[PDB]
Every structure is written in structure tokens, then in C-alpha cells.
Design a protein around this ligand. Structure first.
Ligand SMILES: O=C[C@H](O)[C@@H](O)[C@H](O[C@H]1O[C@H](CO)[C@@H](O[C@H]2O[C@H](CO)[C@@H](O[C@H]3O[C@H](CO)[C@@H](O)[C@H](O)[C@H]3O)[C@H](O)[C@H]2O)[C@H](O)[C@H]1O)[C@H](O)CO
Length: 370
């Protein structure tokens, strides 16, 4: 078990863990059970680690893509929503946490990346990735950069790579084929090449990451950046008249961001497993509870139909939904970790020049389907 009579929660640092802490606080002056909320480093990598020993958090939040893996090694318990509840959330989010029929996590929020442009440096956001190299040239002259986003995490380059054809796993009649992977097809390379050419022509550095890119945009030094709803918080605080709109197309095709549903799974080795489901079911997954976390850091679109209704009013959320609808939701199968890993390298090694688009992407196709 390793817990006793308290509720521990694990959420990632760029999320509104402070707001989630408040739901706990309310849970506390209502249950007497201390809800502890932690955002450890690489919590996604440490959970399977400790949760093996029947430890870790009672609950774990993370995008659904990692939950099929978790369920596999048997580190997650079946959540028990009834036809009653499951009606409150969108179905397409329930599929997201479904692993072979069984549901292993609660869908809390739908997230996608969009183009965040500076309405001062760039009143008219570009429409094509192709427009970028030249919009950056007239800008880099006034000291300012056209764009800049996290190049260290593949997640931020997937919209370009999949735009003209790239994919992770193909969905063929009923399931994802672990053997058919599209990181090496003609479309994937076209995407990574444009990105490598952008850099190769000094339109961005192959070393930029989240901090660096967040600093540049929020400091007003870069006209646009690529990021999710969670990032708006710090921008608001910087003031920066910003915009959130559709990602630029490539080869005439829309950027296709891998869509993730922020889910909350309960450690299988949790002793206070009913408290967790009660905390999640009626407390967090309530307009109130979800409002608390959204005022700390935006969740984006959410599972709860009642609250996504007071949200969809926001141009940012309509934009989040557009890139979302324009892309694909990621699988939850265990192979997503191998997919994600293999691609992180392919994308970095190619950025540095430590490898060619071709060399890198065929090496990743090899690792994933290895
Ligand atoms: O639930 C909330 C979520 O955890 C976020 O707080 C957090 O922030 C966002 O950005 C991520 C990318 O920076 C998104 O993660 C997805 O993509 C990454 C890869 O880019 C996946 O991570 C996997 O691959 C990396 C290798 O680069 C490896 O280190 C990880 O161990 C492996 O899990 C995620 O699984 C995807 O969900 C995220 O959706 C988004 O909210 C992320 O946790 C950031 O790491």
C-alpha cells in the first residue's frame, strides 16, 4: 500500500498544481484528509519506477499517451465511472484513457499546440511555415526574431513533421499497428528538413528549449512561439499583446499537433483508493474544481461538458480546438514511449547536424519498430 490515510497527488510543473492544491484544501476542510500535491522532476519516468514497489502517489496526472504503458506493467487501477458520470465528459476523451476496453484514467483536459504571435511585432500572423524564413529576415534586422519554440522535446516539432505525411503508428481496423510507423515516410522528412533548413539558414537555434523560447517570447524578442494553454499564464503576466491562432500549414497541409488528454490515474497499490476516486469524481472534475486549476494555469479544453461551455467562448480555446481537430489524438499503447524517445533524438541530432534528416529518421524508424 504505502500511504495509510491521506491523498498524495503528482502533477507536472508546467501545470496549475497550486490550483489543484486548493481542491485538496477544500477536500481537507471537508474530509480531514491532507491532500498533498507534488510536482516532481520527470514524474512520468519515476512513477512506473516507485509504483512498482507499490509506492509513489496515490494519483498521477499526465497526458493519456503514457497511460497504456502504465496499465501494461499493472501499475494502474480501473476507475469506476458509471453511465451516469461518463455522460458529463466527452466520449472521445474516455476512449483516450481506455486500454483494451477497460478505463485506466480520468480525462481532465484536452491539449494541443497553437501559434502564439505578438500582436505588436506581428499584427498579421504568417499562414505558412514557408512565409517564415523571409518574415524572419526583415525582423532579425530590427533585432527581433520571427519564431522560437522548444526544440528539445519532439512534441513541438510533430505538427510540422506530420503535416505532409508523418505519423507514429497507423490505425488499421481496430488497433494501432506497432509495425507500421510513419516517422520515416516522405512526409516526415519533408517536415524535419524544412526545420533543419530554417536553422541551417539561421532562422533559429538548434539549442533553443522551453525556458529559452519562453523567455524570448515573453521578453518581446521573438514575434511568435509554439506552445500550449498552460503557457498563457506567464504571458499574461508579461503583458505582451499576444495572439493564439492556427499553426502555419506546410506544403499546403495543416500542421498536425499530437493531441493529448490530461488524465488522472490512481496508483493500483493505493490504500485510500476510494478517497482518490471521490476526490477526482466530485471535486476536481467539477466546474468549481476545474476552475480552480484553470485560474492557476490553463488546462485548455476540458472533458467536463458543463465547463467547456463557459470556456469555448475564448478565442484561445477555439484555436486550441482547431489545431486539435486539425491533428490527431495520440495512442496510449506502451509503444508511445519508444516512439517519443526515438523521435526526440532524431529531431535533435538532425538539428545540431550531428545527423542528416534521412539518417536520423531512419534510425528512429528502426528503433521504434526494432
Ligand atoms: O499532464 C500534463 C503534462 O504532463 C504536462 O505538464 C507537460 O507539458 C506538456 O508538454 C509536453 C512536451 O514538452 C507534452 O508531452 C508529450 O510529449 C512528450 C514528448 O515531447 C512525451 O514525453 C515522452 O517522451 C520524452 C522524450 O522527449 C520522455 O522524456 C518522456 O519520459 C516521455 O513520456 C509525453 O508523454 C507527451 O504527453 C505534454 O502533453 C504537455 O502537457 C509534459 O509532461 C512535458 O514533459
Amino acid at each position: 500500500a504505502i500511504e495509510e490515510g491521506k491523498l498524495v497527488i503528482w502533477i507536472n510543473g508546467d501545470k496549475g498544481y497550486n490550483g489543484l492544491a486548493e481542491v485538496g484544501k477544500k477536500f481537507e476542510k471537508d474530509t480531514g484528509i491532507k491532500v498533498t500535491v507534488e510536482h516532481p522532476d520527470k514524474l512520468e519516468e519515476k512513477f512506473p519506477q516507485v509504483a512498482a514497489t507499490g509506492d509513489g502517489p496515490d494519483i498521477i496526472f499526465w497526458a493519456h499517451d503514457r497511460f497504456g504503458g502504465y496499465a501494461q506493467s499493472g501499475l494502474l487501477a480501473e476507475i469506476t465511472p458509471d453511465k451516469a458520470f461518463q455522460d458529463k465528459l466527452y466520449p472521445f476523451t474516455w476512449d483516450a484513457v481506455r486500454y483494451n476496453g477497460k478505463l485506466i484514467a480520468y480525462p481532465i483536459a484536452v491539449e494541443a499546440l497553437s501559434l502564439i504571435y505578438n500582436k505588436d511585432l506581428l499584427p498579421n500572423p504568417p499562414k505558412t511555415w514557408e512565409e517564415i524564413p523571409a518574415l524572419d529576415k526583415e525582423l532579425k534586422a530590427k533585432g527581433k526574431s520571427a519564431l522560437m519554440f522548444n526544440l528539445q522535446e519532439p512534441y513541438f516539432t510533430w505538427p510540422l513533421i506530420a503535416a505532409d505525411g508523418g505519423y507514429a503508428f497507423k490505425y488499421e481496423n481496430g488497433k494501432y499497428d506497432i509495425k507500421d510507423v510513419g516517422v520515416d515516410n516522405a512526409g516526415a522528412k519533408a517536415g524535419l528538413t524544412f526545420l533543419v533548413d530554417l536553422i541551417k539558414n539561421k532562422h533559429m537555434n538548434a539549442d533553443t528549449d522551453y525556458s529559452i523560447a519562453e523567455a524570448a517570447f515573453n521578453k518581446g524578442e521573438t514575434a511568435m512561439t509554439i506552445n500550449g494553454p498552460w503557457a498563457w499564464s506567464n504571458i499574461d503576466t508579461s503583458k505582451v499583446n499576444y495572439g493564439v491562432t492556427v499553426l502555419p500549414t506546410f506544403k499546403g497541409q495543416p500542421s498536425k499537433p499530437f493531441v493529448g488528454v490530461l488524465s488522472a490515474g490512481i496508483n493500483a497499490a493505493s490504500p485510500n483508493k476510494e478517497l482518490a476516486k471521490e476526490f477526482l469524481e466530485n471535486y476536481l472534475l467539477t466546474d468549481e474544481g476545474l476552475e480552480a486549476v484553470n485560474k492557476d494555469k490553463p488546462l485548455g479544453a476540458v472533458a467536463l461538458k458543463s465547463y467547456e461551455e463557459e470556456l469555448a467562448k475564448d478565442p484561445r480555446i477555439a484555436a486550441t480546438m482547431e489545431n486539435a481537430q486539425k491533428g490527431e489524438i495520440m495512442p496510449n499503447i506502451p509503444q508511445m514511449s519508444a516512439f517519443w524517445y526515438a523521435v526526440r533524438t532524431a529531431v535533435i541530432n538532425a538539428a545540431s547536424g550531428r545527423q542528416t534528416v534521412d539518417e536520423a529518421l531512419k534510425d528512429a524508424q528502426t528503433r521504434i519498430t526494432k
